[PDB]
Amino acid sequence: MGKLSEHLRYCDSILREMLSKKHAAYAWPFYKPVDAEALELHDYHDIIKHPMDLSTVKRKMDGREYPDAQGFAADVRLMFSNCYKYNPPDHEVVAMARKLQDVFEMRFAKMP
Numbered sequence: 153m154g155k156l157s158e159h160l161r162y163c164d165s166i167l168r169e170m171l172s173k174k175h176a177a178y179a180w181p182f183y184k185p186v187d188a189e190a191l192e193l194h195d196y197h198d199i200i201k202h203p204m205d206l207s208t209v210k211r212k213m214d215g216r217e218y219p220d221a222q223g224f225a226a227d228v229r230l231m232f233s234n235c236y237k238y239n240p241p242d243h244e245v246v247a248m249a250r251k252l253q254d255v256f257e258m259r260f261a262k263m264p
């Protein structure tokens with residue numbers, strides 16, 4: 153695969169930070185697709201029409217599917233939005249999403 157553009161090399165760095173040990177205490181719920189059968193979330197796919205998670209963002213980045221930084225960011229925000237949408241606002245996983253999202257939004261805004 154071709155080299156990523158400058159902006160996307162920075163985005164790849166954000167992705168690797170979001171998957172790193174540093175943020176694992178709150179990032180782990182986003183590592184893989186929500187397994188609705190395994191978790192018995194019978195209504196998950198009724199409510200969330202476009203699932204997203206970090207392994208999928210990685211698959212897409214490694215496959216050069218993002219045309220620009222905005223495309224990457226849309227997927228990342230979709231991942232957080234799905235979490236806020238599906239779950240009750242007081243669930244632990246919502247607080248974990250928000251902690252991770254604080255990291256994302258700060259790193260993304262400082263993109264050179």
Ligand SMILES: CC(=O)NCCCCCCNC(C)=O
Binds near residue numbers: 181182234235238245
């Ligand atoms: C996923 C897990 O292994 N344990 C319990 C956490 C449930 C989280 C609800 C579904 N996940 C998201 C990201 O909305």
